[PDB]
Amino acid sequence: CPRFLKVKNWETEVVLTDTLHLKSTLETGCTEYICMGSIMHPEDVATKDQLFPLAKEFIDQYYSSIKRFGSKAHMERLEEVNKEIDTTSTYQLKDTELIYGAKHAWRNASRCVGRIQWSKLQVFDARDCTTAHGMFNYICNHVKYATNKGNLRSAITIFPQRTDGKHDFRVWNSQLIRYAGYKQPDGSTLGDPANVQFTEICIQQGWKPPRGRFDVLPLLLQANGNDPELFQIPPELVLEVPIRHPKFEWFKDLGLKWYGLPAVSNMLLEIGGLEFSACPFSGWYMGTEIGVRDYCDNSRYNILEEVAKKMNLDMRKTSSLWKDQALVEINIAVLYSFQSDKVTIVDHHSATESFIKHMENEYRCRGGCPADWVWIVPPMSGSITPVFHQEMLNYRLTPSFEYQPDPWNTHVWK
Amino acid sequence: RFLKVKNWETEVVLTDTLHLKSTLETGCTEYICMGSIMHPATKDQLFPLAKEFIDQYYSSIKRFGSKAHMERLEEVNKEIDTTSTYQLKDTELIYGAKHAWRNASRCVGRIQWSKLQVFDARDCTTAHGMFNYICNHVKYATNKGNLRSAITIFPQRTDGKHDFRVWNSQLIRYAGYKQPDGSTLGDPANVQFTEICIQQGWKPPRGRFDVLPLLLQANGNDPELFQIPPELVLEVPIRHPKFEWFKDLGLKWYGLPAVSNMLLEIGGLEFSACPFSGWYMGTEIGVRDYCDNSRYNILEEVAKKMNLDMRKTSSLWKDQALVEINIAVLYSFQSDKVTIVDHHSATESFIKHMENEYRCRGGCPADWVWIVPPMSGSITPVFHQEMLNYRLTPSFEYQPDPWNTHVWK
Ligand code: HEM
Ligand code: HEM
Ligand SMILES: Cc1cc(N)nc2cc(-c3cccc(CCN)c3)ccc12
Ligand SMILES: Cc1cc(N)nc2cc(-c3cccc(CCN)c3)ccc12
Ligand SMILES: C[C@H](O)[C@H](O)[C@H]1CNc2nc(N)[nH]c(=O)c2N1
Ligand SMILES: C[C@H](O)[C@H](O)[C@H]1CNc2nc(N)[nH]c(=O)c2N1
Ligand SMILES: [Zn+2]
C-alpha cells in the first residue's frame, strides 16, 4: 500500500501517476500471487449497518464533487439519509444525486473505451414506474430519444431500486434491441446464435416468431417482482443499417443489416449502496463491435467464410491469412454503411485515440482512471492502436455498473 | 483453493491447482490489477530455494526421497556452507532450463518446451570464449533454416561485480541510427545500443539492415566487440505472393530470433547470460518490428503502393496494409524454407498445450495480455480463453540494461 502508482506508455514514453486507486472499494479477484485480469466474472440485500457507511461514502463524495463538502446542506443530507435508513432500512436519492451516480458509474467502468463522453449522458428517472406497461412506455421514449433519427445520443433510464429482493424490476433482454436466434432440428442456427436461449424463453412466454434472419426480439419486462410480460417494440423506432461495401458490389447480396442503437439492459447500477436492477443504457457503436464480434465470431453469424469465398481467397492454409483479410473488409463495410446512412458510429482507431486522451485528462485532474486493457484493446489490429502500448491500472470504483444473474434463473413464478 | 478457467467460444472449463504451488508475487493486490504493466542473495536465502528446486527435480523423475535425493540435498547443503553457493549438475541444469521456458507466462510457443537443446557454457571465462559458444549456438539453432530451439548458459552470478552479460538485446539485430534532420535510418528500437557500439570503435556501414556486432562481457570485465561471421546469419528478403512491387520496398529480416538480455533463475542461482532462441511467429516481425511507430514504421509506404485512400482512419487503411505485410512475411519465410509460424497455428498449438498442462500438471500460467496476437485477436482461439497468471520457478526474469550499472575500467 504505497500512495503513488505509475503507468507508462511504451510508444510515447509518457508516464502518468495514479492516486485515485486509493479510493478503490471492492476486491478485484486478483491476489498477491495470482492475476484474474482475463477472467470474465471473478439476494444479500443490504442491512442497516452495511448501508449507513455505503450511503455516507457516496453522499460525502457527492458534496465533494460540487464543492460543498462539510457545508450545512451536506450535513443535513447525511442526517436525513441516516434517519431514513433507520426507519425504512433504505433511502431515496434526490434527482441530483441520482444523475451524479449514473454519470459516475459510466465514468468508473474500467472496461468501457467510450468514457470520454461520460459527462454528456441523458438520465431518465423512471423510479415512479409501477407496471410492465409503464416500463415499456419509458423504454420506447428512451429508444426514440437515444436514436434521434441517426444522430445517436447516450442515455440511461433508471427504474425503481431493489427493496426486499422479491420485488425487483428487470429487463430480461440483454439488449433492448437484439435479433432472434432459432435453433433448428438439423443442428444449424438461423438468426443470431448468441440469443438462441432468450428466443426460446420469449417463444415459451407467447411470442409468435417470424422465424427470419433479422427478427427484432420483443421486450420481456418485469415490474415489482411480477412475472415478466411481452411487448413488441414499434418497428419504426428500431433504426437499422443495411450493410454494403464501397468497392465490393456483391457485398450487399450477402443480405446483412444491423441495428444502430446498442442498448445494454441486463446490468445493475449500484449507487451509495442502492441497487437498480433495471437500468438500460445506450450509446453508439464502435465498428468492431458489429464487424468483428457480432459477425465473425464462430458462435455468431460466421460470414467470415462466405466473404472469403466471394473474395476468392485461398482458404486451405491459414498462413494465407484469408481470415484476417476477410475480417478487415467486413469492418470496412460496417463503417461505410453506418456513415452513408448518417448513423453515428466510431472506428476503433478514432475511439482508442479518444480514450487515451480521456485517460490522460483523467489522470491529470482526477488522480487516475481505472481501465481494463484486456477489454479496452479492440479485437482487431490491437498493436497499431494507441492503447496497446499503454499501461493501465484496473480497480473498482463506486458508483458502478455490475453484472447480475439472469432473471429466469432466479425468478419465483407466480 | 481450486480455480476454473472457461473458454467461452467452446465452453470448455479447466481446473487450476498448479497456482497453489507458486510463491513469487505477481504485482497485483486484492484491490488493483496490474496485468497490463510490463515490469511490476546469501547462504540464508539460498538453501530453501535450492531445496525447493531439488525437490521438484526428484519429484519430476519420480524419485522423491530416494537415496540420491537425500544425498543430493546433503551435497548441496554442505556446498552452500563452505562456499556460500553451489553448482547445478548437468541434469538439473537441463531440467531447470526446460522448466523456465515451460513456466514462461507470456510465451505462446511453449508447446515445444521439452524440445530444448541446452548448451552448458559454465566453464567459460572470457569474452572470446563467449563468442565461441555464441557462434556455435547460432550455427546449431539456425540449422540451415530448419530452426531448432536452444539455450546457452554461461556461469552463474557470484558477487555481482563479476556478471557475464550479452549486451545485445538479441544475438542478431539491425543497427538504428539517429539522422541529422531527425528521422532514423534502420531499426529505431536499437538506436541507443548502436551508439554504444560506435563508441567502442564499431565501424557502422550506416545502412538500413546492418547486422550489429556482439558486445560481450565476461567475469564483470569491460565488454568486447565481435563480428558474427555473415555465413552464420540467415536472412530473408521479404516479398509478396501477389504484389510485384513489394520486393522494391527492399525489406528483409533475419531468420533467428534469439533473446539474449534476460536472466535465467534456477534453484536460487542466477544466470545473467543465457541467450535462448526459437523460431518466429510472423506478427513479431510483420506487426511489431515493421509497423510499430517506434520501429520500422512502413505502413504509410505500403498502403501508398496499395493506392488506398489514407485521409480518414475509418477506411481502415492501416488495417489493410497491416494484413498484406504479414502475408508477405509468412510467404517469404516459407518460400525460403525457414521455420516460421502464423499467429493462427501458434494460438491453436497453445490452446492444445494449455489443455495438456491442465491434464498432466494441474495448470498452466499464462498472460492473456501477451498471449493474444497483436493483430486479428478475436479470431484466434486464445481471445476467448480465460487464463490464470502466476509466477512459477524456474523462470526467465528481466534484468537492468548493463550500461546502466557497469563501471568502466
Ligand atoms: C457512447 C459511446 C460508447 C461506446 C463507443 C462504448 C464502447 C464500448 C465497448 C466497445 C465496450 C466493450 C464491450 C464489448 O466488447 O462488447 C464497452 C463496454 C462497456 N460500456 Fe461503453 N460504450 C459507450 C457508451 C457507454 C455508456 C453510455 C455506458 C453507461 C452509461 C457504458 C457502460 C459500459 C459498461 C458498463 C461496459 C462493460 C463493463 C463491464 O462489463 O463491466 N458505455 N463500451
Ligand atoms: C519455439 C518457438 C517460439 C515461438 C513461436 C515463440 C513466440 C513468442 C512470442 C510471440 C512471444 C511474445 C513476445 C513479444 O511479442 O514481445 C514470446 C515470449 C517469450 N518467450 Fe517464446 N517463442 C518460442 C520459443 C521460446 C524459447 C525457446 C524460449 C526460451 C527457452 C522462450 C521464452 C520466452 C520468454 C521468456 C518470453 C517472455 C516471457 C515473459 O516475459 O514472461 N520462447 N514467445
Ligand atoms: C452503451 C454501450 C455502447 C457500446 N457501443 N457498447 C456497449 C457494450 C456493452 C457491453 C458490456 C459488457 C458486455 C457486452 C457484450 C457481451 N460480450 C457489452 C455495454 C454498453 C455498451
Ligand atoms: C525465443 C523467442 C522466440 C520468439 N519467436 N520470440 C521471442 C520473444 C521474446 C521476447 C520477450 C520479451 C520481450 C520481447 C520483445 C519486446 N516486446 C521479446 C523472447 C524470446 C522469443
Ligand atoms: C477470455 C476473455 O477475458 C474474454 O473473452 C474477453 C477478452 N476481451 C474482450 N474484449 C472486448 N472488448 N470484448 C469482449 O467480449 C472480450 N472478451
Ligand atoms: C503496455 C503493454 O502491456 C505492453 O505494450 C505489451 C502489451 N502486450 C504485448 N504482447 C506482446 N506479445 N508483445 C508486446 O510487446 C506487448 N506489449
Ligand atoms: Zn491482476
Among B9, B37, B379, beta carbon nearest to A327: B379
- Helix A304-311 crosses helix A322-340 at what angle (to 10 degrees)? 100
B297 touches chain A (CB under 8 A): no
Q: Which helix (H) or strand (E) covers residue A194, if one does?
A: none
Q: Report the half-sphere exposure of B246 (CA within 13 A, side-chain side).
A: 21
Chain B partners within 8 Å of A369 (Cβ):
none
DSSP string, B319-384: HHHHHHHHHHHHHHHHHTT--EE-HHHHHHHHHHHHHHHHHHTS-----HHHHS-SSSGGGSTTTT
User: What is the CA angle A188-A194-A198, rounded to 5?
Assistant: 100
The answer to whether B377 contacts A373, with C-beta atoms less than 8 Å apart, is: no
Alpha carbon distance B150, B275 (integer Å): 8
Among B29, B326, B390, beta carbon nearest to A321: B326
Which ligand 2 atom is nearest residue B284's CA? Answer: 15
Ordered domains of chain B (ranges, CATH): 16-122+149-159+263-277+347-371 (3.90.340.10), 123-148+163-234+398-402 (3.90.440.10), 235-257+280-345 (3.90.1230.10)
Distance A379 CA to ligand 5 centre (A): 8
B339 touches chain A (CB under 8 A): no
Cell of A284: 453508439
A10 is catalytic: no
> Which distant-in-sequence residues (6+ apart) come within 8 Å of B175 by Cβ?
B186, B187, B190, B194, B197, B204, B205, B206, B207, B210, B211, B212
Is the distance from the beta carbon of residue A231 to the nearest atom of ligand 5 less than 6 Å?
no
Using DSSP, how many helices (H) and how many strands (E) does chain B show?
A: 10, 18
A202 is catalytic: no
- Helix A72-88 crosses helix A48-65 at what angle (to 10 degrees)? 160
Q: SS3 of B100, please? A: helix
φ/ψ of residue A161, rounded to 5: -70, 155
Q: Which of A267, A283, A294 is nearest to A173 (CA)?
A: A267
Alpha carbon distance A135, A141 (integer Å): 10
Q: Report the half-sphere exposure of A369 (CA within 13 A, side-chain side).
A: 27
Peptide linkage before B394 cis (omega within 30 of 0): yes
Alpha carbon distance A178, A261 (integer Å): 10
Q: Which helix (H) or strand (E) covers residue A6, if one does?
A: strand A5-8
Would the CA dihedral through B77, B79, B85, B87 be positive or negative? negative
Q: Which of A65, A74, A77, A50 is nearest to A365 (CA)?
A: A65
Annotated binding residues of B, written as ranges, equal 36, 107, 170, 279-280, 284, 369-370, 383, 398
Give first-to-last CA distance, chain A, whole Å: 50
Alpha carbon distance B394, A238 (integer Å): 57
Residues forming beta bridges with residue A400, ordered by sequence position:
A270
DSSP string, B19-43: GGG--B--S--SS-B-TT-S----H
Would the CA dihedral through B140, B145, B146, B152 be positive or negative? positive
Q: Which helix (H) or strand (E) covers residue B239, if one does?
A: none
Q: Which of B242, B384, B303, B314 is nearest to A322 (CA)?
A: B242
Pocket lined around ligand 3, Cβ cut-off 6 Å: A 262, 264, 281-283, 285-286, 289
* Helix residue ranges, H only, B281-316: 282-283, 299-305
Cβ atoms of B101 and B113 closer than 8 Å: yes
* Closest A-chain CA to B315: A332
Which amino acid makes up residue B144? K
DSSP B232: G
Chain A partners within 8 Å of B3 (Cβ):
34
3-state secondary structure A218-258: CEEEECCCCCCEEECCCCCCCCEEECCCCCCHHHHHHCCEE
Q: List residues of B with catalytic annotation.
A: 107, 110, 279, 284
Look up cell 518460400; give the residue.
B335
Cβ atoms of A3 and B284 closer than 8 Å: no
> Which distant-in-sequence residues (6+ apart) come within 8 Å of A66 by Cβ?
none
Residues forming beta bridges with residue A398, ordered by sequence position:
none
DSSP string, A82-137: HHHHHHHS-----HHHHHHHHHHHHHT-TT-TTGGGTTS-EEEE-TT--SHHHHHH
Q: Write the residue with the smallest CA distance to atom 17 of ligand 6.
A: A389
Q: What is the dihedral of CA A317, A319, A325, A330, to 10 degrees?
A: 60
Q: Write the residue with the smallest CA distance to atom 16 of ligand 5.
A: A375
Cell of A381: 489490429
Q: Report the half-sphere exposure of B103 (CA within 13 A, side-chain side).
A: 22
Q: Which of B53, B7, B97, B19 is nearest to B362 (CA)?
A: B19
Cβ atoms of A280 and A171 closer than 8 Å: yes
Alpha carbon distance B346, B353 (integer Å): 10
Which amino acid makes up residue B72? R
Q: Are strands A240-242 and A257-259 parallel, antiparallel or unpaired?
A: antiparallel
Count of other CB atoms within 10 angstroms of residue B53: 23
Give the length of chain A. Answer: 414
Mutational pocket test of ligand 5: of A28, A30, A40, the residue with most ligand atoms within 8 Å of the beta carbon: A40
Alpha carbon distance B370, B293 (integer Å): 19
Among B27, B342, B387, beta carbon nearest to A319: B342
Residues forming beta bridges with residue A274, ordered by sequence position:
A271
User: What is the CA angle B201-B207-B210, rounded to 5?
Assistant: 65
> Which distant-in-sequence residues (6+ apart) come within 8 Å of A197 by Cβ?
none
* Closest A-chain CA to B312: A350
Cell of B218: 565476461
Residue B397, burial from CB neighbour count under 10 angstroms (0-12, 13-18, 19+): middle
Q: Which of A333, A335, A340 is nearest to A351 (CA)?
A: A335
Cβ atoms of A230 and A205 closer than 8 Å: yes
Cell of A43: 439476494
Cβ atoms of A114 and A107 closer than 8 Å: no
A409 touches chain B (CB under 8 A): no
